[PDB]
């Protein structure tokens, strides 16, 4: 999957904490433990999404080859790869 | 046929992959075009961009020729 998905998840967690503060009338830096928990959850959620990227590509190539669609070996590496793009 | 077109495309991709040039030469100011018998040169993108660079070079050189001759004729 994508190489920078965990950093994107951490930025998502920071924005999550800032919005939870803004909704309840607090300044952006208040309750930094909420930011930290949000960062951890965002990191692991977007890493799981990046794992599903590779899983979906593997499922597509496996189903297509079992149906009779013969893919050349120069193009099978586009699918059967845990590519860290 | 389709097989011959495919093998030619593979050869062109291999050549343009392993290409280098140094010592005062700019790539994308090539000395010669790539001569081909292709129907629609845009079938092979590397050849299309190479001949595009060569054609750009020729247009600018012809403009410069016009300027040199205009100075001579004025003299």
């Amino acid at each position: 999957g994508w190489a920078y998905s965990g950093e994107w998840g951490m930025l998502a967690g920071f924005c999550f904490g800032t919005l939870k503060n803004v909704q309840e009338g607090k300044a952006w830096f208040r309750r930094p433990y909420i930011h930290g928990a949000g960062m951890i959850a965002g990191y692991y959620l977007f890493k799981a999404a990046a794992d599903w990227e590779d899983e979906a590509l593997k499922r597509i190539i496996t189903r297509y080859e079992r149906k009779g669609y013969a893919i050349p070996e120069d193009r099978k590496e586009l699918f059967a790869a845990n590519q860290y793009k | 046929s389709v097989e011959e077109r495919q093998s030619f495309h593979d050869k062109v991709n291999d050549v343009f992959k392993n290409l280098t040039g140094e010592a005062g030469k700019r790539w994308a100011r090539p000395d010669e075009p790539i001569l081909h018998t292709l129907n629609d040169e845009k079938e092979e993108p590397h050849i299309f961009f190479h001949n595009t660079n060569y054609r750009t070079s020729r247009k600018y050189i012809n403009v410069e020729k016009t300027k040199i001759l205009r100075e001579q004729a004025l003299e």
Binding site: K67, R75, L78 | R26
Partner: protein, 64 residues
């Protein structure tokens, strides 16, 4: 006027024409791999999951 000559030398030293060519080739290669992957994926059949003829090759186990 010597500053101009030294800045010209700095431009020539920093520019690397072979690195420009490798940048161009990597751009073309990444785009071509995306296009190839997307073209293979677009052979996208769609029936219901219980279609045992359209999905005849899947290794499915049923509990009924």
């Amino acid at each position: 006027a010597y500053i101009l000559d030294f800045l010209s030398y700095m431009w020539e030293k920093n520019n690397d024409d072979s690195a420009s060519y490798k940048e161009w080739q990597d751009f073309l290669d990444v785009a071509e791999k995306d296009r190839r992957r997307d073209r293979i994926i677009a052979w996208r059949e769609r029936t219901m999951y219980d279609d045992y003829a359209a999905n005849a090759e899947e290794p499915i186990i049923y509990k009924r």
